[PDB]
Amino acid sequence: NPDFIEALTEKITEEVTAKVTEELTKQNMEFFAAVAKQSQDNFDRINKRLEERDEKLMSTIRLIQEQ
Amino acid sequence: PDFIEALTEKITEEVTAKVTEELTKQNMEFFAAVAKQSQDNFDRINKRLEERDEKLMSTIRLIQ
Amino acid sequence: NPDFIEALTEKITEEVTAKVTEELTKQNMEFFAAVAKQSQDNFDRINKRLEERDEKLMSTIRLIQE
Amino acid sequence: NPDFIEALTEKITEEVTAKVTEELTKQNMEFFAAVAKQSQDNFDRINKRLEERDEKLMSTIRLIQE
């Protein structure tokens, strides 16, 4: 019967699909989390740069003024 | 053979067609999200640099 | 017998794999190429905007002087 | 022949799954690495620009007004 062929194929297609897409999902999650981490670390580094720069600037403005 | 040929060709097309599709669909959704957090990140930086430069100048002028 | 099963299995396995990877590769090529253009485009914006704020800045430090 | 069909069904599913997962894994590592490096190369890009910006802005104010 082509019913038996259709059926056996779909069983195999489903199992292979399920277990392939499950693994590729887990790998994509891990990559998403790690890129976010990367992004925050990047933002934090930048916001420190701005803090130091704003401070050094205001310090220098202050020294100009006191003259 | 007619059977084994039929089953073999069937399994191959079917697994290939459906795996490609399911990963593709899944990729479109991932590549969309990764591009958004990417642009969100740029929007974040931009807005922060805009604001701090505006505060720098408004400082400078106002103090001098 | 098993050799035959084993042979059908290596054939199916390789036909599928080659087709799937040849697909997820071409896909990853597009996305890579697109995140690069987005990355550079976003760099060009931030740079212009810094130029514009350096000009405003010099204009200001030029007036404070006058 | 149930034993033959069974035998063939098991091996195809194990092997196709094993072979595909492994290739995509391999493709993904190579692929993820290149997103991640392009990403940090872009962040470095911004950083060295802000370092140089802030440094020039600093030098101007001190040279002009101090």
Author numbering:
A (entry chain C): 110 to 176
B (entry chain D): 111 to 174
C (entry chain A), D (entry chain B): 110 to 175
Excerpt from the publication:
Type I and II partition systems employ a Walker-type ATPase ParA and an actin-like ATPase ParM, respectively, whereas type III systems use an FtsZ/tubulin-like GTPase TubZ. TubY is a DNA-binding protein with a putative helix-turn-helix (HTH) motif that functions as a transcriptional activator of the tubRZ operon. More importantly, TubY modulates the interaction between the segrosome and the TubZ filaments; however, it remains unclear how TubY is involved in plasmid segregation. This study shows that B. cereus TubY is a novel membrane-binding transcription factor and segrosome component by binding to the TubR-centromere complex, suggesting that the cell membrane is involved in the process of type III systems.
Here, I report the crystal structure of the TubY C-terminal coiled-coil domain of the pXO1-like plasmid pBc10987 from Bacillus cereus. The crystal structure of the BcY C terminus revealed that the coiled-coil region is a parallel tetramerization domain, demonstrating that BcY is a unique tetrameric MerR-like transcriptional regulator.
